[PDB]
Every structure is written in structure tokens, then in C-alpha cells.
A paper describes a structure:
After adding 100 μM RN-1747 to the mTRPV4 protein sample and resolving the density map with cryo-EM, we did not observe any density resembling RN-1747 in the S1-S4 pocket. Furthermore, when we mutated the residues in the S1-S4 pocket, which lead to large changes in GSK101 or Agonist-1 activation, the concentration-response curves of RN-1747 remained unchanged. Therefore, though we have not directly observed where RN-1747 binds to in mTRPV4, we believe that RN-1747 does not bind to the S1-S4 pocket employed by GSK101 or Agonist-1.
The transient receptor potential vanilloid 4 (TRPV4) channel is a polymodal receptor that is activated by warm temperature, osmolarity changes, and many ligands. Like other members in the TRPV family, TRPV4 is critically involved in a plethora of physiological processes like temperature sensation, osmoregulation, and mechanotransduction. To understand how the TRPV4 channel is activated and inhibited by ligands and to facilitate drug development targeting this channel in the future, we have resolved the structures of mouse TRPV4 in the apo state (mTRPV4apo, 3.6 Å), in complex with the agonist GSK1016790A (GSK101) (mTRPV4GSK101, 3.6 Å), in complex with both GSK101 and ruthenium red (RR) (mTRPV4GSK101_RR, 3.7 Å) and in complex with Agonist-1 and RR (mTRPV4Agonist1_RR, 3.9 Å) states by cryo-electron microscopy (cryo-EM).
Author numbering:
A (entry chain A): 148 to 531, 549 to 637, 658 to 688, 696 to 764, 774 to 786
B (entry chain B): 675 to 688, 696 to 738
C (entry chain D): 484 to 531, 549 to 611
D (entry chain D): 739 to 764, 774 to 786
Amino acid sequence: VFNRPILFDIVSRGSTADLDGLLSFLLTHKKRLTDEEFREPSTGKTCLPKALLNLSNGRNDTIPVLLDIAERTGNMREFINSPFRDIYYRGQTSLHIAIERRCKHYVELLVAQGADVHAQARGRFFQPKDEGGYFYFGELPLSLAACTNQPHIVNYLTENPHKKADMRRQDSRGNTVLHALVAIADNTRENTKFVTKMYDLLLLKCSRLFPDSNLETVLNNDGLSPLMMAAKTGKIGVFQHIIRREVTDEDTRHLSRKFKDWAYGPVYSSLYDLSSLDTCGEEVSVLEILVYNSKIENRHEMLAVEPINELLRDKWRKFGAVSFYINVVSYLCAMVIFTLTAYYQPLEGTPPYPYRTTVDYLRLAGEVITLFTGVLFFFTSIKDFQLLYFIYSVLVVVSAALYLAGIEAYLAVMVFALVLGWMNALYFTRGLKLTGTYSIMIQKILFKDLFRFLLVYLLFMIGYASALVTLLNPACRDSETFSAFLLDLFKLTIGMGDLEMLSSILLLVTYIILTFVLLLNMLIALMGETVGQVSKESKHIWKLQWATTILDIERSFPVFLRKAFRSGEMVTVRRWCFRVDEVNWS
Amino acid sequence: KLTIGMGDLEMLSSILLLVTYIILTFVLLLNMLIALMGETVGQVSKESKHIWKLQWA
Amino acid sequence: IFTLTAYYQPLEGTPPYPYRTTVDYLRLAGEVITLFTGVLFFFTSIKDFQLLYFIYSVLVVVSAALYLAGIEAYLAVMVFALVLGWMNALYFTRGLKLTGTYSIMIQKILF
Amino acid sequence: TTILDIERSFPVFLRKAFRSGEMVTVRRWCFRVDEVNWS
């Protein structure tokens, strides 16, 4: 009125007599209901938002009568939609608010009046929880009705006698209702159940409306696809149902992911449809995302879903074992050849081309094999953990270059290459003999032990040294200042004992006692932490390393060569199916 | 053998990658013993109070 | 800085005021920093686990007093201050790198 | 312990405090927390 706040209070309180008098003088002053007077200077909130936020147990049946003011004001189109301007709320519309409050009557009234169901609420508060926002639902009224556990209004909005927001419509993020529904999907039981139920309903409805292309196919700007998005973001709750989706209606057969081909009583040959878990290098697949990504929080249980686990096992038995054994054996033999070439490295130095003997010819063959494997490894690395492999490749290349120069005193790089490669040997052997605790061990204690040791060791060493050189301007030395003899003395103490000093001062013994006890109890704590962490690797870590090895091998050799998983039918049941056999007596 | 069991190792040198070799082998053997202890205690679990019964039978 | 000052502690003993060199000036700056931190720690302790911190502060103060006396054979208190302070170093590092098992270890087996 | 020791260490008259809030009926130095529940 004279000031907006009293109008806002009146609309919040739901008064009508004063309110239709307000309408009266608004008619008198020819002022549009969307004027700056009715919108905040900062937020620009209209009457409708404030009225709906004050929803009193669904008793806002009157404020539509207020909205009836609009056509009298002559500005109806812009009035319904409310394009907010706050960075904290950008684009939020009255329809979003009405649907949010979990009441369908006002949603029906607004949409029937012509509410713009295609609303892109690109507000910071609407962005995912990890992008500074608080709630992401797909930035669409239909996706907002969906994500918020609101079946009836998603049905109605898709079945209203007026403009009905097509499920296909993609927001700015490109998500669509399915992607949004998996975005807020939680791994908890209630969220998982409601999300999966509504997800089924939604996909079935879209299929019935659009048999030409099921909504699963349509991707986002990222391009993941709903299943791959539930995979990349650790959404086991949806994922585990996405894999095993089988429905009833005949018109909805294609939109299933687990057929049942034949049964013989207590044996069921369930035919999973992994039409997107292995693209043969064509596009991204759930296996690549699931295994070659660490942001997942539920990797181990997400590798336990039936088709993925059985498919890893099949790729292992069929081709993984042979290729892995060939690779590891070839690596070991080639590097043993390298090691023997180093052992038989031409004596007397100066190897310009010292090979005039049969054993010399064998040595030259071994060196050629070493260079070939090194250059091939460099090619793989550049085409492609990889850190150490590339270090080995470059070291081999440099050693070969220096050797071909016929210069001396530069075999050191060759020895470095040897030692780095054999250190990679344990990385490769991880997959053999069902091993791999060693890799966990190397990535567990390595840094902590060196950190603490180096620090306290050198530290008490210098503390010792100050007083020692205080005593002597003899025993630890003959002359001059060198902490090196004191370092040697401390090594003698820690590993050897029988320590000698010029003194024959007690704080020195205190230093020794403290460092010794600290290192011993450090080893004890490392043992305890390691045993706690591993817990026999929970029987899962090795499985993840195994999957890593299998997929690495599969990607290694070209896939145009016909090494693929099972195949299947042509139409109505050309889906590259995979089989699984399970017996149940229920 | 002197290095692993005895220490007080001597060389012609008086080259660092040698010390790296020594450190890596020593740490590997120690943590190998640790892992063997852990796996043994996990496996036995006081032989689950059954293995000895099978040997007895 | 304290530890390096001890390592570079003026040779031949008798440090009345032996700083006529650039490296000597750097050593004097390090010793001044040591005394400043020691006296500040004493101020915090008197204003204020605290046991060892106060021991370090008093040891630094006594070492500074003896050094300013220009007398010899009394750097021992300085070395005591150094070792006690670095023992407090683990107490302070408890909060860094999500550590702290070491403090539990020291208060578990020691006695 | 470390956090509170640090906070007490430097003077508090320097304006390093927790969240703030309203004036009356809701001058209580409130603090906020965000939690999502699907019940």
C-alpha cells in the first residue's frame, strides 16, 4: 500500500476485506501488480511467493482469489512466473514453491491458470551440496515434484489438461528427471526405496508416452547417462536396482535389464542385459567408471552386483589369466636378461661395440631385448602407477643413449633402471599367487617411518653434538668439526651398541634412551595400525586390484580383435546380453 | 648377509643407490615378517578350537 | 634456529661477545630469536603440559643469564633447554598430520 | 583441546567469534547447522 511490508503482512495473514479494498485502490492507481512497489529491492519477491511460504496447513485457498487480481491489473503473463534475482535464489518460481509445500490443489490452480512449467531455477541454493548449494533437484518443476517424494503431482503435471512439462526436457545441467532423481539418491533404505519406486514409475510413464526412445538413452551435458551417473557418484541404492530392472507390461519389455530366458525348476538362467557395461572401447561404460575412479565411496559393494562381478570373473577365466601370466612371465624373463647383461656387462669398461665372441653375441642379444622392452614400455606409457613405469622407460632410454656414445662411468643409469624395474616387479607380482598385501604394506608405513626417524634421529644427533663439541675443542675424532662421526656413533648405538665417547654427559644417555624407545614403540604402533587397517584386507581390496588388472589387460590389447563377453538375440529380447546361473529352492 | 644380520657393512666406496638397496631389502623383510605374523594369527584364531580335533581323529 | 646456534655456538669457548663477522651477526640474530621466544614462552606460562613448557622457559632464561656472564662450561643448560624443547616438539606435533598416537604411547609404557 | 587453547591464547576482544543472528523474539547469538532428512 503506502509501504509494501503492510501488504506482505496482510497477504501472510490471509485477510480478505482489507485485501479486496487493497485490490480496489490498486485498480484506482493503475499500478501493475508486478511493479517495483510489490517486489523487494534486493530479492524482488512478489505477493505469491510470500503468500505460499506462509502456507497455513494448506489453507491458502483464498490467495488464488488474490491472484484473480492479476487479469484486472492487465499484467498476467509476467505475474505468474517470479524470476527472482538473488544470487542465493535465482529463477525460483511460485510453481516450485507450491509443489514443494506438498499440496497439489494450488499446483493445479497455478498450472491451469498457465504457470510456466518450463522453469529453470538456476539458483546457487539449488546447486548440489558440493557446489556451495543446499538442494539440487534438476532445476525443473517436474523434477522438483519428483525428487521431493511427490508421486501424485508428478502424475498430474504430466497428465494436466494444459501444458504438461515433458519428462524429456533437460535443465541447464542437462540432467532431466532421472539424473536429478539419482543425484539426490542416498544409500540409505528409505531414500533408496522411494527413489527407485518413483524412478520406475517415471521411466515407465515416459516409455508409454514416448516408445520411440526410452528416457534412459538421453544423456546430460556430462553425457554419463542415468546409470553411469548413479555409478560415478556412489549411488548403490539406485544402481543395484538399475541393473536388475525387469517389468511386466508388454509395451515396456525393451526397458528391462534382466530377462529370464529359461528355467528348469530350481535352476534359473537369468540373462542380464549389460548393453552398456562394456562398450568395447566405443564409449564410457560402468566398468571403466566404477573401477578407474576413486571418488566412489562404495567401490567394493558396487563391484558385488551380480553382472559386474560375474563379468569380471568371466573376463578373467576366458582371457585375463592367460594374458596376465604371459605379461608377468615376459616381464620377469626380460628383466632377468637385463640383470644378467648387467652381470656380464663388458669388463674393463669402454664398451664402444665389444662383441666379437659367441657369448658376446648372446650378451648383445640380451641388451637388444632390454632396449626393445624399454622402448616398448616408453611407447605404452606415452600412449597411456604409470609414474614409476615411465621413470623406468626414460632411464632405459638414457642408459642406451649413453652406452651407444661409447663413454665410460655412465653405467650408473643402467643400474638405476634395473633397480626401479625390479621395484616395479612387486607391483606386477601383486596379481600373482593371490598376493597384494605387499603393495598395501609399501603404501602404509613407508612415509611415516622415514618422517619420524629422520626427524628425531638427526635432531637428537645435533643435540648430542652440541654438548660433545662443548666437551672437546680425540675419541669421536682427531680434529675439525664433522657431524658425520656423530651420525656414525648414533648408528652404532641404535643398531650396534657398544657406543664409545670421549666421556668416560648423562643427558647423552638420556638422548640415546629416548630415541631407542621412541623408535621401538613407533614400530609397535605401525604394526598395530597396519593390522587394524588391513583386517585381512577385509577380503575386498585384493578383489579391487584384481579388477584393475583385468580391465588394464583388456584395454591394453586392441579391442577390434574379437575378444568380447557373451552375445545374444537380435530383436525384441540386438542387446548384447550376458548370462548367469543361480539355483534357488523357493 | 653381514648387512641384514650383522650390519657394520664395508665397501670399497667410502654409490648411494647401494644404501637404497639395503634399506629397501631390510624394510621389505621386516614388514614381510609382520604380514606373516598377522596372517598366521588371523588364520589360526586359536585353530578355531577344531583343527586339533581333526588331527586327533 | 636455536639448534643451529648451538651447532655454530662460538668455538674455543669464552663467548663474552664474540661477534665481529657477518656469519657471527647471523648467529647473534639466531641467539636473540632464541632468547625472545624463551622469554615470550615464560610470559605465556606465568600468564597461563604447562610443566615441561615452564621448564623449557626457565632453562632458556638461565642459559641466557649464564651466557651474558661470559663464563665457560655452562652451555650444558643450553643443551638441556634444547632437548626439553624438542621433546615438547612431539607434544605440539600431536595436532599435525592427524597424529597423536605418540603422546598416548609416551603416557602408556614409560613408567 | 588444541582448538580451545588457540582460541583462548590470542585476545578475544578481537572480533573472532562464531555465527551471529537476530535482535529480539528469535538478541541470541545463534549458530546454524544444516541437515537433510527424508522422513
